[PDB]
Each structure stands twice: as C-alpha cells, then as structure tokens.
Amino acid sequence: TNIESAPSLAPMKHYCDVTGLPAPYLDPKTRLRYHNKEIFAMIRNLPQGMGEQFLEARGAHTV
Amino acid sequence: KRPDPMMIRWVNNKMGSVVAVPEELLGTHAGVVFGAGP
C-alpha cells in the first residue's frame, strides 16, 4: 500500500554533528551535537549558515 | 452545616447520653453496632 514502517521506541544514540564520533554534549546555542572542546570551538566559529548546513545532514534544519 | 464524615459523636448531659453517627458511616462496618451495617 506504500505505507510500510514506523519510528523506533528505543532511545537514540548521540553523535557529533561535525565528525560523527560519539557526542556527550549538545550545544545550547547552535543546537549542534559535538564531541569535545576542540569541535565546540570550531562550531562557534562557523561561517554564516554553516550551522544549518550541518543540521541538514541530520535532516534537522530549521524548516 | 454537616458533620465530619468520619467522626462519631458522643454527648452527655443532665438527660443522659446519646451517640450520633454520620449517614456516611451507616452502611459501613462502623454502622453495624448501631444496627445499620452494609
């Protein structure tokens, strides 16, 4: 019927939006998940619109 | 005014003594002694 799957109820693992490594941390400001202080520093210095570009790979962009 | 649903009242005076029972307690196990159980 072309209607054929449903979301999981298992809780979701957290991965770094930049590097895909496991992420302990969720940035409050930019909503990116990040692995460590090195990537938090880089995340806060992204060019305009690059934060949304990282959310797009997760399918989580603002629209 | 309505009496407390859980409290039975005893009162005594020159005429003697009475006990009065809430109608919320008649039909309970507490009513049985007064002849008014479940």
Next chain:
Amino acid sequence: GACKRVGRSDAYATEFDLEAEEYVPIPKGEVHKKKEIVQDVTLHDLDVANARPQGGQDIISMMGQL
C-alpha cells in the same frame, strides 16, 4: 532465590542526557549459566545462624549498644 540489580542497560543510556543512573553493557555471555560449587561451612556457622537473626535480617543492629 538471590537476585541483584547490576544496573540499567546502556542501550537506555540516552533516555535522558542526565539521570542519576548506572548504565552497564548488556551481558555478552550466555544468559543462563550452570556452575558446580563445593560449599564449606562449619558447625559454628550453623550455631551462629540459629542463635540470632543475622545480616540483613537484623537491621536494628545498626544502633549498636544493646
């Protein structure tokens, strides 16, 4: 008839970002294990066990004194 909570399985580790909980990996071995144990006691252990409530049975012992 003994049982122990080892923890919560770490497949649930991201239910929340913080919870006061001890997440442990799922056991990687067989879920059931059968072991031969030769157990030694002494007649004094039986005396002690029969004379008074012992261990977690006797919680009020924590007060000391009498």
Next chain:
Amino acid sequence: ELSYRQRAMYQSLRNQISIMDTLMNLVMQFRKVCNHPDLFERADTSSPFFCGHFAETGSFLREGTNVALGYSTRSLVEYRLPRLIWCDGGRLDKPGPGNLVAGFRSKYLNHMMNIWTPENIRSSLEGIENFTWLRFVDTSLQEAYRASHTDVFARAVDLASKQNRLGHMQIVYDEPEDKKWTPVHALFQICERENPKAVAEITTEGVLRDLMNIARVKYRELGLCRLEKAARPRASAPPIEVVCDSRSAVIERENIMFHPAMRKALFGPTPSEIKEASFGPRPVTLYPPRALLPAPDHDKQRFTNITVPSMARFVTDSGKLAKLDELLRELKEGGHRVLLYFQMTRMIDLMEEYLTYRNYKY
C-alpha cells in the same frame, strides 16, 4: 544593676577598650545594653551548633512562592569506599557475581539447616525432644519461626497486634469452679496468666493501681516534664554516610537510613488508610494498629533541642526593665500608664511588647 546577660555584653564591649583606652559609638552601645540587651542583639529561636552539610538558599528573591524542600542534611565526615568493597562483593552477606558464597549460605543457614523452620521443629515436637515445650507456650510453629528470624524491632511491632487475653481470664475465670482455667496450649504461660497488675486495673478503689503509678505520678508532680531545659548538647550531627559512586549505594542508603517499614511503624497509618479502614463494609487491620513512637518525656521540648525565647526572660534580661516592672505593678494603683520617657525610639517598641505581655493599657 545589670542582668547577667547585660553584664556579659557590657564586658565584651570593654574588651574593645583594650585597643582604644569609636568611643562615641562604644558609649552609645553601652547605653543600648543598659536599656535592654535586645536593643544590641535580640534573643531568638536557637539550637545547638549543627555539624553538617546542607544546601543553603542563595537568593531569596528568585525562590518564589512555591518551593520544594528536599532533605539535604548530610554529614561532613564523609567515608569514601570503592564499589569493589561496598557494592561488588566486598560485603560478605550480599549475593551477586563475585560473591557466590552469600546466596548459598543465606538459603542453607536460614532455611534448610535451620532448627527453627517449621519442617525441622515438627520433627522434634514430642517426648523429651528439644521443641517439646512448644505445645504450651502459646505460640504456633509459624510464630516460633517468625520470632527466630525477625529482629527485635520487627517483633515488637508484631507484639503491638496482640491482646493480654490471659490477663482477662484472670478477671473472668475467678471462682473455684473455674479451676483457674487456662488454655492448655498456653499452660506454661504462667506469669502472664496470674499477676497482680491485671486485677489492680479493675478494682473500684485503685489502691494497688496507685501504688504502681507512684514513680510517674511523682515525676509529673515535680513539674520536671514542664521545667525549662537547663542543658542541651552543644553540637549536633547527622549520621556518617558511605560515599560510593554507585546507584546501588544510593538505593541502599534510602533502604536503611530512611527505612520505610520502621518509619511507617513509628508514625503509623496514612490518611488514606484511615479512610479505607473506616468506610469499608468490613473491618480491616492496619500494618501498625497505631503510631508506635513513644510520647516524649518533656511536654514542651519533645524530640528537639530547639529553644524559643520567652517573655519571662525578656523582662528579667534588663535590670531596668525588671526594676520597672516591679514598680509598675504598684503604680498601677496610681495610674500614670504612659508617664514614661525614652532616649531611644526602639526602646519604646520593646516597651509595647512588654506592656502587651502585661496587658497594660497605654
């Protein structure tokens, strides 16, 4: 003359003179204490030094109107154990992986090879065998097995659910034809079936009842239940805790140190249980039938070392006020209710509190 409280303050002020032989402010606060020591540092509800951690409030303004008061009280002596010892089988009695002895030993020593289990007792219940007496001590094999395994607190709660029926038989089974009747299953319960106490409860003039109450009557007659506490502990602390970084350790702290069944026994039934017990079609028993915490020996101090200031101290803490009170209680015959003058404004407010204590009109 100064009260002992004033004298102590005045002394601590003249200790400052050791630097100085601010004197204007000193003499002004000398004037304060000579008026009343509550002008200098007002007496307040007080308690022993507390030797413990707690979470204090950082902001009053941001707290708002609704707040949850958690129990933060914690010992500063803070014993740190590795979970290898405190959790993972360094405790011999607790079974688990890496403590294979404990689960076996628990079953075998408390049930299998335990003389008090009903299957074992029943083999020895006869003749000159060791449980032969059990037939007459008014307890079942189930009750014998319970008393051997529960601790003296748990047994004491169970003992709340019992009746002095052998003492009532003494009231009832009384005539020679009653032959001092006793249930044969209670035959050895001799001292319970006969003692003077039960009879003394029932006689119309309580001579033997009063004689048995002398000690507690005398205690209350002396007012020692109502006299102010003359001493208290200077420091107070909560129990020491294990600090172990496991969730099981935290669970265990709650199970033992805040033990639910003991607390429930002490403080008794909850309000819903009293409703369910009262509105049901049939009676129902409650885990404890009542709150089993004792009545406090001191009627005002109860179970705390907190002390509250009183108007009696307030009058006597100023020598002037004590003297003034004595003369006011005769000048009341002359009147002059407000013929009083003060060099300090707050002293007038304190005098309103004193007058209202005396109920003297302005």
